[PDB]
Design a binder for this molecule. Sequence first.
Ligand SMILES: *[C@@H]1O[C@H](CO)[C@@H](O[C@@H]2O[C@H](CO)[C@@H](O[C@@H]3O[C@H](CO[C@H]4O[C@H](CO)[C@@H](O)[C@H](O[C@H]5O[C@H](CO)[C@@H](O)[C@H](O)[C@@H]5O[C@H]5O[C@H](CO)[C@@H](O)[C@H](O)[C@@H]5O)[C@@H]4O)[C@@H](O)[C@H](O[C@H]4O[C@H](CO)[C@@H](O)[C@H](O)[C@@H]4O[C@H]4O[C@H](CO)[C@@H](O)[C@H](O)[C@@H]4O)[C@@H]3O)[C@H](O)[C@H]2NC(C)=O)[C@H](O)[C@H]1NC(C)=O
Ligand SMILES: O=C(c1ccc(-c2ccc(Cl)cc2)cc1)N1C[C@@H]2CN(C(=O)c3ccc4[nH]nnc4c3)C[C@H]2C1
Ligand SMILES: [Ca+2]
Ligand code: NA
Ligand code: NA
Ligand SMILES: [Zn+2]
Length: 806
Amino acid sequence: WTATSGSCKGRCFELQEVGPPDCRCDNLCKSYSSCCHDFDELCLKTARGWECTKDRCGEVRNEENACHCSEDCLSRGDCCTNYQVVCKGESHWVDDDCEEIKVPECPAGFVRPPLIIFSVDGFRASYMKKGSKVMPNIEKLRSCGTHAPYMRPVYPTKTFPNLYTLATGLYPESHGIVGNSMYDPVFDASFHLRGREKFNHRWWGGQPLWITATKQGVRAGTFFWSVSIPHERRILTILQWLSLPDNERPSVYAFYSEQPDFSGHKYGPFGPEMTNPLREIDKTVGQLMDGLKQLRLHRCVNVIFVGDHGMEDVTCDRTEFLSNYLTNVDDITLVPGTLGRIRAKSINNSKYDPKTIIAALTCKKPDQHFKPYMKQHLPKRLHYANNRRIEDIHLLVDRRWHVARKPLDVYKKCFFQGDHGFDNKVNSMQTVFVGYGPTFKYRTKVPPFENIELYNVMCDLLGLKPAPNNGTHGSLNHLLRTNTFRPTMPDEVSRPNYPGIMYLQSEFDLGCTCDDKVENKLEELNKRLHTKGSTKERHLLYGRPAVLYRTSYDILYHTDFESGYSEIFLMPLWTSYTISKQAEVSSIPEHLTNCVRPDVRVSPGFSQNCLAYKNDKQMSYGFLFPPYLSSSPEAKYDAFLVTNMVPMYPAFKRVWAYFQRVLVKKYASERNGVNVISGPIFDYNYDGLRDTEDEIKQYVEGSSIPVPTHYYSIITSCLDFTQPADKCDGPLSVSSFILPHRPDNDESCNSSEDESKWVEELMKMHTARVRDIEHLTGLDFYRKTSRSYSEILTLKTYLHTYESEI
Ligand SMILES: *[C@@H]1O[C@H](CO)[C@@H](O[C@@H]2O[C@H](CO)[C@@H](O[C@@H]3O[C@H](CO[C@H]4O[C@H](CO)[C@@H](O)[C@H](O[C@H]5O[C@H](CO)[C@@H](O)[C@H](O)[C@@H]5O[C@H]5O[C@H](CO)[C@@H](O)[C@H](O)[C@@H]5O)[C@@H]4O)[C@@H](O)[C@H](O[C@H]4O[C@H](CO)[C@@H](O)[C@H](O)[C@@H]4O[C@H]4O[C@H](CO)[C@@H](O)[C@H](O)[C@@H]4O)[C@@H]3O)[C@H](O)[C@H]2NC(C)=O)[C@H](O)[C@H]1NC(C)=O
Ligand SMILES: O=C(c1ccc(-c2ccc(Cl)cc2)cc1)N1C[C@@H]2CN(C(=O)c3ccc4[nH]nnc4c3)C[C@H]2C1
Ligand SMILES: [Ca+2]
Ligand code: NA
Ligand code: NA
Ligand SMILES: [Zn+2]
């Protein structure tokens, strides 16, 4: 109940929210059905339109007008945005040459450059180039300010998850808005685009920029606009707020456009009808910048032009129906469309089984346009599992397609030609970032980056301390002229032991054998050198990883590789080795096929054993440093140490052996040498964070050998590939992956074929940032390079996507 008897008189677009039943006059009241009786008449004036014409100049103030062209309008802060152009001979902002803004030029009483976030829904990154002819205002912001060729959204590439990720720096699994539609089984409550539950605070986790600002004494304009408030009015409202007295005036503002998403859904991303919405958005930008220029704020304000996600061609005919796969289609609830989420229709149904549902959905049709996953098996780069609102069963839908439960859902709910939601590495889902103002750089292009990184920068722009988030603070310092945040490397928590030879071969009873009993001071002094680190500069190029948690581990040196061996987990946390362009691949000699060798630097009690693998009928083993890449037949024996062994399902060994025998050499040839760091990951509770020893759900049968959920590799080389990986003088280049360690290759529908047809495609799907591996391992990489730390942070957030040209 709202008693709408009060008045909006002198309260139009007031900043403080007033609770029921006193009537509201803020930009949200429409959505709440709570506006005072006179809100429209007083606050939403439209009379005479939005532009001054010659004859309006000098007019006597008529209060009924939408905006004014009277002589007092500048000081009332309520001129039409084109007033100075029409009435005072000024130019439109877009027509002025751009000139570097070296320092803020703010009027008196401005304590900091204000920040204006201009967010556009469904603005696909390629619009910046493809519509540049019809968007001169946006093209000027882009060419004169700082821009990326594209910004990567979060998964799913839906509106509410991405806008709230923009506001918080958080993955949707952490902020809680994991779709536009959700069911929370703890609340027993549903979040819908339609209705009042979505307003309830309990859906919205983390701390959005406007709350961060407010808690730290920086006032914010409201970010939310009721759909019926016309864009011209939203702009006039911002400009009016910017004329408030100093103590009242917000420092951060947001504008939001429903376009081009609205038309893109109807017409497709490049429908001929899309030119007009792009023009209109440009005009709105022109209005804002002209209005800032009148207020003398156009060289004071930092403006961010940012999208939530792109738009792909999708039509009704490209829909896959679960009724063509499942017999029990009525025992399931599906969240449908460009992603699928499946749960039981009824909690009282004990004949519901996710395993038979996944199996009925796996590789069933030749050209199947979706792939099912238990959420824990989704690519770790999606970070989409650790929330109770995310259903256990997930369908990743191919770009251009939908999934639906039954055909009746698609015709009794073609209409649409565009949609979004797909995998966030898809080219069509990329969106835009432009920053313009005194704090951003001048005419600077920056590499693509992820939207989770912006919250930190928006905090930096406002002098705020960000709440804890998933951005990596300092990774976007290269966007900024000043206000850079100067991070320090994390302190190493555990120091390594450097074991020498401490055990005799007969102290070991590991059930392993090796045909290695074959035999010289020339070569013996030499192998002693290798075991103390004499080749360590070749194989460990960026310093040893730092261990950021409390544990007990040994550094082990070898001719061809170095490792940090965990006495707790019984295997390396990391193994580092360099493969030059000239290196040669060899096979494992016949007599060494089953060779495992005790490591005389590491006690039997802190070693694995071969008996456990013999007795575990499901589990085999692989090696982190690959015997195929040994530098010499004698160095090969090091690769068969028990301290280089890791548990691997036979099915996973197919992937791993192809990566090690074929792909590392291929990368070394292509990149002029590579440095590889590989190791295990344990994330049994799928939170994206290193498991402690007591979280491990699976061991090699009858042993204390923990089974990894994933294996990672970080592959680094010189960005200037004319220099070899091991003699690189400048910036680095990296690609990484986090491969799921699974007992089957059900994920790969072509896995019955030769690895050359399916392994690399698997690995591409599981591409990752170094930072993702850092979270999963508690390791910090690239501690000793000649590069600035900020540049290294950027490298660690890089994701190699394998998409073609945007
Ligand atoms: C991305 O960045 C984010 C932000 O930094 C990272 O998320 C953080 O990670 C931490 C580790 O997972 C986590 O810390 C925990 O905090 C618990 C208290 O949390 C509340 O308070 C904070 C602060 O205001 C608040 O933000 C939290 O909000 C969550 O939950 C609400 C309501 O459900 C949601 O609205 C909100 O969206 C958010 O949900 C997300 O996080 C939670 C986990 O907190 C998930 O469950 C959700 O699925 C969702 O992802 C909370 O309101 C605190 O209780 C924890 O401490 C336990 O464990 C430690 C072990 O060290 C121990 O010291 C304690 O004793 C305690 O153990 C006891 O509880 C156990 C579990 O119940 C029980 O088993 C034991 O027996 C004990 O009784 C813990 O410190 C932090 O909350 C989140 N923050 C956010 C915002 O999500 C994220 O990791 C980053 N991702 C990556 C990949 O890097
Ligand atoms: O009020 C806001 C808001 C604006 C900006 C920021 C914002 C957040 C962070 C920053 Cl940094 C800036 C602005 C925060 C909220 N709304 C209201 C709008 C309602 N809505 C949809 O109904 C909708 C739209 C497109 C879709 N496609 N498919 N389904 C769709 C459903 C989109 C919502 C956005
Ligand atoms: Ca974990
Ligand atoms: Na076995
Ligand atoms: Na398969
Ligand atoms: Zn949309």
